[PDB]
């Protein structure tokens, strides 16, 4: 009902949230020819055996993810309140979170068009296939999709979308985190900042998108554990490391 205005500090976290967005996704994707070649071998049967023998998408969506990692990593210091926290919860915040606000954040990237990723030119087109060619499995790649699909759907505005990412990040139920109650008093405000905004941007809809929101991030943590047990499964390849890279094995290890 009530539709309060966002007060001077929210506005704040807002802005800086937006800016830190802008500086740490680039939607030309110009970067990429910097990542390793994307390699996609013929595997239209999706066989496990080939595709793990092959591994051929890997070297560049690791590349991908980890590049996607530092930036991350940047945005989420730039989020007001995070650098209140200990070294420590800090990077536990980032290494439980990475993989959820990658898939997040790409849904900026991703089209109902044709259900892919583009980023750019054919070669930075990702579709299930491609996933697949990296080691992962429909398990995965199916709820992913649908995730992407239902978040589109939702037509969040840029302010919304690094909220949640935010809020994504700077969460008190995360394991390990020393300091809940700093943690949460963060993610509040933050929250309150989403909430207000809402009211303020939509009429009460408001509440149903602010619930469809928060349900997202409890789909993100299933996507999270089923990432977490291919991860798994992958790292057993032999020669898997030289095919990921440092931040990825540490972050996801
Ligand atoms: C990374 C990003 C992008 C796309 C994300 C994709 C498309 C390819 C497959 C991925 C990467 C999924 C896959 C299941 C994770 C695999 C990770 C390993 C191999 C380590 O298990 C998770 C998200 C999926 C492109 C762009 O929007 C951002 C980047 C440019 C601004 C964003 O940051």
Same mark, same amino acid.
């Not at 898939?103 to 980023?119: K, Q, V, Y």
């Not at 995730?147 to 994504?168: D, P, R, S, T």
């Not at 700077?170 to 020393?178: E, F």
């Given at each position: 009902?009530?539709?309060?205005?966002?007060?001077?500090?929210?506005?704040?976290?807002?802005?800086?949230?937006?800016?830190?967005?802008?500086?740490?996704?680039?939607?030309?994707?110009?970067?990429?020819?910097?990542?390793?070649?994307?390699?996609?071998?013929?595997?239209?049967?999706?066989?496990?055996?080939?595709?793990?023998?092959?591994?051929?998408?890997?070297?560049?969506?690791?590349?991908?993810?980890?590049?996607?990692?530092?930036?991350?990593?940047?945005?989420?210091?730039?989020?007001?309140?995070?650098?209140?926290?200990? #070294?420590? !919860?800090?990077?536990?915040?980032?290494?439980?979170?990475? &993989? +959820?606000? *990658?898939?997040? =954040?790409?849904?900026?990237?991703?089209?109902?068009?044709?259900?892919?990723?583009?980023?750019?030119?054919?070669?930075?087109?990702?579709?299930?296939?491609?996933?697949?060619?990296?080691?992962?499995?429909?398990?995965?790649?199916?709820?992913?999709?649908?995730?992407?699909?239902?978040?589109?759907?939702?037509?969040?505005?840029?302010?919304?979308?690094?909220?949640?990412?935010?809020?994504?990040?700077? #969460?008190? !139920?995360?394991?390990?985190?020393?300091?809940?109650?700093? &943690? +949460?008093? *963060?993610?509040? =405000?933050?929250?309150?900042?989403?909430?207000?905004?809402?009211?303020?941007?939509?009429?009460?809809?408001?509440?149903?998108?602010?619930?469809?929101?928060?349900?997202?991030?409890?789909?993100?943590?299933?996507?999270?554990?089923?990432?977490?047990?291919?991860?798994?499964?992958?790292?057993?390849?032999?020669?898997?490391?030289?095919?990921?890279?440092?931040?990825?094995?540490?972050?996801?290890?």
């Amino acid at each position: 009902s009530l539709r309060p205005k966002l007060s001077e500090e929210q506005q704040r976290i807002i802005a800086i949230l937006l800016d830190a967005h802008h500086k740490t996704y680039d939607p030309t994707y110009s970067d990429f020819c910097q990542f390793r070649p994307p390699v996609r071998v013929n595997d239209g049967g999706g066989s496990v055996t080939l595709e793990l023998s092959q591994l051929s998408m890997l070297p560049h969506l690791a590349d991908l993810v980890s590049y996607s990692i530092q930036k991350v990593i940047g945005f989420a210091k730039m989020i007001p309140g995070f650098r209140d926290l200990t #070294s420590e !919860d800090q990077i536990v915040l980032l290494k439980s979170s990475a &993989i +959820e606000v *990658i898939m997040l =954040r790409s849904n900026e990237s991703f089209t109902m068009d044709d259900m892919s990723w583009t980023c750019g030119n054919q070669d930075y087109k990702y579709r299930v296939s491609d996933v697949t060619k990296a080691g992962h499995s429909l398990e995965l790649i199916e709820p992913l999709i649908k995730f992407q699909v239902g978040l589109k759907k939702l037509n969040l505005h840029e302010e919304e979308h690094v909220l949640l990412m935010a809020i994504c990040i700077v #969460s008190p !139920d995360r394991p390990g985190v020393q300091d809940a109650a700093l &943690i +949460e008093a *963060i993610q509040d =405000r933050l929250s309150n900042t989403l909430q207000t905004y809402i009211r303020c941007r939509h009429p009460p809809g408001s509440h149903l998108l602010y619930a469809k929101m928060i349900q997202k991030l409890a789909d993100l943590r299933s996507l999270n554990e089923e990432h977490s047990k291919q991860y798994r499964c992958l790292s057993f390849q032999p020669e898997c490391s030289m095919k990921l890279t440092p931040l990825v094995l540490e972050v996801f290890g």
